[model samples]
Target chain A: MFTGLNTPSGVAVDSAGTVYVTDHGNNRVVKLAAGSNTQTVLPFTGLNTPHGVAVDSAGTVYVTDHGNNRVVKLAAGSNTQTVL
Target chain B: MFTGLNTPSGVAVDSAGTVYVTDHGNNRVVKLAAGSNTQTVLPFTGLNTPHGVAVDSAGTVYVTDHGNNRVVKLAAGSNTQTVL
Candidate 1:
């Protein structure tokens, strides 16, 4: 159970058990790796009302940036986005 | 890419390639099994602004009902939910 999240709106889990969440009010994405209680904010920035999140088996992350009216992809281990 | 979704918010993909999406405006969750174009609306009902969704390796589904401020679990192959 997480505490102190600001309007979290989406979640996804990779095969390795890394959990990803989109915090809408905060306009950020966070992750809880397997076996860890600590949540780490992802490298994504400039997100406006980030809503839905998805992670593929390859570890690529996707986000539905609602306010921006766009979908963005973050490749594994990279902070830069490839907007879709 | 899906069409006709009313404010789809969250999405999750199980190991078997089943894709689950939370249709927020529709107040429902839908799934797209691997190799299928048809989206199937899940059996869950009375959901108020369902937001986040996650599926474990065991195929159990978890959803954060945003409007109701509750978490729910759907055991594999079961339509009924166990609210958490």
Candidate 2:
């Protein structure tokens, strides 16, 4: 259950069942960590019209920043992002 | 612009304007090259309930291979997928 999310565009779940979503309207990625009800945004780079979010097995994060026209990657437990 | 797709879910475009879609009902991802109608599925492991898809600048693809509960990645122009 997530709150403070508006206009979501993409969503994904990890093996641990943590939820990841692209909150396009807010231009951010929100993560609902496993076993919790709290909603927190991944503190990565700025986003514009994000459309997709995926978390790989290694826990790395990927998102399609639609407005920026590029994909952003965040390493596991990282707040920084690299456009690839 | 795409056709012959069933239960299309997520869609993203690359810098080159090539479109990618998660054909959930088909349990696969379909690629629509810019200005082309030929849809192609990447030669990777079978999917169960493929969901979101995103392509980075290098053309590498990231997909949420849903029902299998894993995220997968395909290098630019390569069919091999690395389960992330």
Candidate 3:
């Protein structure tokens, strides 16, 4: 039951059924909860054109920084980020 | 000097400075000699929709088979292929 998204660069689903989407041109990732409208999960700060995202088995999120040519990882229990 | 290629789905430069490009819609990979025009290195035969191409350090060429959901690796200095 997934609708085709325009410029859907990256996607990840959380354990709680939260879907995160990287809206490339918008420079932000939106979270769509189970039964609610989409909302901005992470503000449009410190992100220089995100392109791809992948969620690991432990709920760790990985995002690709296209502009900087690097991957940033969001740990499972940490708000702070790590660049890989 | 490299010219911008149209629909250049995949690219790999050999040790000898040869450039290989996978033209998806054209259904073939063309090899352009160091200073020569593009020539059909491998015809569209036996390829069912190629999407990506990569060359290894040893000069082996790998191509993604979109239609088969697999990858075929062409060995170095050999015309034989192994599916991965």
Candidate 4:
């Protein structure tokens, strides 16, 4: 029962079943807990045109910010980031 | 020398290097000729939430049209529909 989305550009589900969504228009990322269905915003910000999102085996998240013309990687469960 | 994309959600390159981009916001798909860079909009349309895309050995295109809760598949150069 959540509608906290505006143009969700990309999405991926972690091994744990958590859902990560790239809120394109909102310039943020949203997380949906596997079974809880609770939506939480990832601590990362200042992203322009956040598009595609992906999670690695280590649980790290990689997002393709289209507007920024780059890929941002975030540490698992944290806001720590790097550009590639 | 071409630019006609509105929030490209996903990108794929075929064996021939043809570029296929899912224009999420535009609700369309754009294909760039391998060498000519010619921008061609695939005949498929009415797709909402086009997120990830992929191409197969058969040149079939698979797109994750999330909002539609379906993966739209297109055969080589045809607009045939196969949703899974």
Candidate 5:
């Protein structure tokens, strides 16, 4: 079972089986990369109430940056988010 | 622009381009069917603060029923959600 999650609010899975989740209470998006058991915290810092997350066919990640009132995207293989 | 959504929190698009969204403030999920312009409210009623949404490649829809503290799945070609 996934542990240490506080009020996990959102989740999405990519074609590669990578799982992305919005840890609402933690104010960050965490992902379980395909073939990995450990949960990795996305590099994005200062996330405020991140709510929902999705991944497109190209593996681009999209997130609803709820607290910031904006949508952000992270390209595949990248570590930073670009506000959309 | 999508209109009248109180707090659209989550969104997902399927292989065929059908778009699904969780309208948090309105307590429902809505979709824009592929090749259609109108947004259709999903048939689920009595939803409270629906949040995250996702669509698998098979077209099954998943949602986090926040207020109810449960997760639900709606199979492709089905309207009702099954608690998961």
Candidate 6:
């Protein structure tokens, strides 16, 4: 039951059914658990408009920052970002 | 001097400054020569909805086959496709 989403551009689900969505207009990514209404994760903040989100096999989250013209990789369980 | 492009989804320019555009609606890739109005290259034909055209360092063209749910790579100057 996805609701209150603003311009959701990208989505990825982990093996555990945790959904991650790139809320482009909101400038953040939201993680929602399966059958859960609460958002458990909003890992990064103050992004200049994110467009795409992909998770590598290693669980590293790669997000395409459209306004920045680059992709950023966020390690699993860490807020630190590596710009590509 | 770009003109008459209909919803160009992706673009890649080779070292020779030839521009390749994934014309999704046209179901083909179109290449335009730099500083010229003519399209000099159209390598692949009958693509099933192409998007996101990219070029490797070797000048090979890679296009995302949206309808086919795969990526197709074309060797330089060759029409044969290598699906990825």
Q: What is the TM-score (0 to 1) of candidate 3? A: 0.46
Error of 1 at B54 (Å): 2.7
In model 2, the runs with Cα more than 4 Å from the true position are B1-84
Which segments of model 1 are wrong by more than 4 Å? B1-49, B68-84
lDDT of 3 by residue, A1-84 (tens): 222233334544555544555655566555455456545465434787776565665767777778888888776567777888
User: Who is ahead in TM-score, 5 or 6?
Assistant: 5
Model 5 stretches astray by more than 4 angstroms: A1-7, A16-19, A26-50, A55-84, B1-3
**Each model's Cα RMSD:** 4.9, 10.2, 11.7, 7.1, 4.8, 10.5
Better of 1 and 2 by TM-score: 1
lDDT (CA) per prediction: 0.79, 0.74, 0.59, 0.71, 0.76, 0.66
User: Where does model 3 exceed 4 Å of error?
Assistant: A1-84, B1-6, B43-45
Reference contacts recovered by each candidate, as fractions? 0.37, 0.04, 0.00, 0.06, 0.35, 0.00
Model 1 shows how many backbone clashes? 0
lDDT of 4: 0.71
Off by over 4 Å in 4: B1-49, B53-84
Better of 3 and 4 by DockQ: 4
lDDT of 6 by residue, A6-84 (tens): 5455555554545556666678776665467667556765578876666655667888888888888887778888888
| CAPRI class of candidate 4 | incorrect
- Interface root-mean-square deviation, each candidate: 2.7, 9.4, 11.2, 6.7, 2.9, 10.9
Q: State the lDDT of candidate 4 residue by residue for A1-84, as single tens digits.
A: 234566565666555655577766678877665467457777775588887787776878888878788999888757678888
Clashing pairs in 5: none
Lowest lDDT 10-residue stretch of candidate 3 chain A: A1-10
Report clash pairs, candidate 6. none
Over A2-80, each residue of candidate 5 has an lDDT whose tens digit, in order, gives 4456666798987776667777877887777645767777877567788878788898888888988988888877987
Candidates sorted by TM-score, descending order?
1, 5, 2, 4, 6, 3
| Decoy 1 TM-score against native | 0.64
Least accurate 10 contiguous residues by lDDT in model 2 chain A: A62-71
TM-score of chain A of 6: 0.81
Tell me the tens digit of each residue's lDDT in model 1 across A5-56: 6656787778886777776777888777767766778888778888888888
